[PDB]
Amino acid sequence: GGNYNYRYRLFRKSNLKPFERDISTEIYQAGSTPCNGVQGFNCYFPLQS
Amino acid sequence: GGNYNYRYRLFRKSNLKPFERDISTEIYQAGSTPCNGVQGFNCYFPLQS
């Protein structure tokens, strides 16, 4: 049936440090308008399945 | 950087009728456990970019 339980981070403000663990799940604003916790245009979920 | 503003459905209860339009977004239970609006384990967002 397909596995979608394995995700990976896709968007971040900056690169990670060595041995750095990032777990935050917050709506990512890639544009010039607030997302207000709404997954819409120019507002992408940081984790991709 | 890649465009991610185009999305399509990935899960449904059944198939669409001819010339049918579905726009409703809702958590899809790919298992046997209620999800109540979480993209966790066996609970998948219907759309994919």
Q: How far apart are alpha carbons A23 and B10 in whole angstroms?
A: 26
- A19 Ramachandran zone, left/alpha/beta (phi>0; psi -120 to 50): left
CB A11 within 8 A of CB A48: no
Resolution in units of Å: 3.2
CB atoms closer than 10 angstroms to residue A30: 13
- B34 Ramachandran zone, left/alpha/beta (phi>0; psi -120 to 50): beta
Q: Shortest CB distance from B30 goes to which of A1, A41, A44?
A: A1
Q: Of A34, A48, A42, whose CA–CA distance to B3 is shortest?
A: A42
C-alpha distance from A18 to closest chain B C-alpha (Å)? 24
| Chain A interface includes B4 (CB < 8 A) | yes
Q: Of A34, A2, A23, A35, whose CA–CA distance to B48 is shortest?
A: A2
The technique by which this structure was obtained is cryo-EM
Q: Of B14, B15, B43, whose CA–CA distance to B31 is shortest?
A: B43
List Cβ<8 Å contacts ≥24 apart for A38-47.
A41/B5, A42/B5, A44/A10, A44/A11, A44/B4, A44/B49, A45/B39, A45/B45, A46/A9, A46/A10, A46/A11, A46/A12, A47/A7, A47/A8, A47/A9, A47/A10
Q: Nearest-CA residue of chain B relative to A7? A: B40
Residue type, A8: Y
Q: How far apart are alpha carbons B44 and B46 in whole angstroms?
A: 6
Q: How far apart are alpha carbons B26 and B42 in whole angstroms?
A: 14
Q: Nearest-CA residue of chain A relative to B28? A: A4
